[PDB]
């Protein structure tokens, strides 16, 4: 049947839609405007298996009500990727962005939706105050920040992401006999990779910054995951039964900016001499890798595809 993809304009969500159309799924995406919908319709070459509903503000808890009033009989899988005084402008909006679509499911399609896949984040896993060499974050690690502590300019974003995921798990806890669906969350780190459409910013800006940096520019910035890997995991999350109830930590290891510079220098020979020169908190997500069962893209691959697309836009 039909798959609902929230926020289909997203860097990840467009790839999710491409993967679902790859497998001949019927896809209903939600975007913030009619212009966005028509743009995406054109870019996917008028595929009759793809349609869109307009949901402008997912800070409204009733945002997805019309979607499930119209298509509640056909939506079998839901992939929720969209996301919207720190308590009144970030925290409560995030909790609501999680709870609203689930309330709509509970209202209008409680026995049709079988799987819900929610894009969370590594920010809901890491502990900012433990960034100690013996601490390893796994899929079961949770960000311990409290509601009161999440209202400062350091703990606001990670706190809102954390409580947004907690809200989904709590909804499933308190609504076992009102809904049928099972829940899986996707928790990515820094997401690199190419845009689905050349014609079209993200954290890839980092790469874009070093691709254009003068050679005199001074050079572990975190962990990386390719956007196509995140998209593929989103679909396996509703297809495979061993992914039921799992938090899938999407990461493929640490990276530095010098790694980006080295890839740029050796794989794009036109840039050597025009860019900085070459030079010859831990995560354990082996469980996510085993459960997913496929090999992630390496840092070299994701950087190469990002840079190749950027240089193709520039006529280089």
Catalytic residues: 161
Taking CA atoms, 70 is separated from 90, 109, 112, 179, in Å, by 30, 10, 13, 18
Number of Cβ atoms within 10 Å of the Cβ of 202: 17
DSSP 95-144: HHHHHHHHHHHHHH-TTT--EEEEE--GGGT--GGG---S-EE-TT----
**Cβ burial 140-166 (10 Å sphere, 16+ → b, else e):** ebebebeeeebbeeebbebbbbbbbbb
SS3 27: strand
Residue whose pair of structure tokens reads 């962990």 in the numeric block = 223
- For the chain, helix (H) and strand (E) counts, in that order, are 11, 12
**Cβ burial 239-275 (10 Å sphere, 16+ → b, else e):** eeeebeebbbbbbbebbebebbbbbbbeebeebeeeb
Structure tokens at 222: 């975190």
């Amino acid at each position: 049947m039909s798959v609902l993809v929230s926020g289909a304009t997203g860097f990840i969500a467009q790839h999710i839609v491409n993967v679902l159309l790859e497998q001949n799924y019927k896809v209903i995406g939600t975007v913030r405007s009619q212009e966005k919908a028509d743009k995406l319709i054109k870019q996917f070459n008028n595929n009759p298996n793809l349609s869109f509903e307009i949901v402008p503000d997912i800070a409204n808890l009733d945002a997805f009500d019309e979607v499930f009033k119209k298509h509640g009989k056909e939506i079998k899988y839901v992939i929720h990727t969209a996301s919207p005084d720190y308590e009144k402008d970030l925290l409560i909006p995030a909790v609501n962005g999680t709870k609203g679509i689930l309330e709509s499911i509970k209202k209008y399609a409680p026995d049709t939706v079988e799987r819900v896949v929610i894009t969370s984040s590594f920010a809901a896993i890491m502990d900012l105050n433990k960034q100690d060499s013996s601490v390893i974050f796994t899929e079961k690690s949770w960000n311990p920040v409290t509601w009161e502590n999440a209202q400062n300019a350091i703990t606001a974003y990670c706190g809102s992401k954390t409580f947004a995921e907690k809200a989904a798990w709590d909804f499933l806890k308190e609504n076992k006999d009102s809904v049928k669906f099972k829940l899986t969350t996707i928790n990515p780190v820094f997401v690199f990779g190419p845009q689905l459409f050349d014609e079209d910013n993200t954290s890839c800006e980092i790469i874009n910054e070093l691709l254009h940096a003068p050679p005199d520019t001074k050079v572990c910035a975190g962990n990386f995951i390719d956007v196509r890997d995140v998209a593929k995991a989103h679909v396996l999350a509703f297809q495979k039964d061993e992914l039921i109830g799992k938090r899938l930590l999407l990461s493929n290891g640490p990276f530095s900016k010098q790694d980006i510079v080295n890839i740029l220098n050796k794989d794009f020979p036109q840039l050597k001499g025009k860019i900085p020169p070459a030079d010859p908190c831990k995560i354990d997500n082996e469980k996510t890798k085993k459960l997913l069962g496929f090999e992630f893209k390496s840092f070299e691959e994701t950087v190469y595809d990002t840079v190749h697309q950027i240089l193709k836009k520039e006529g280089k």
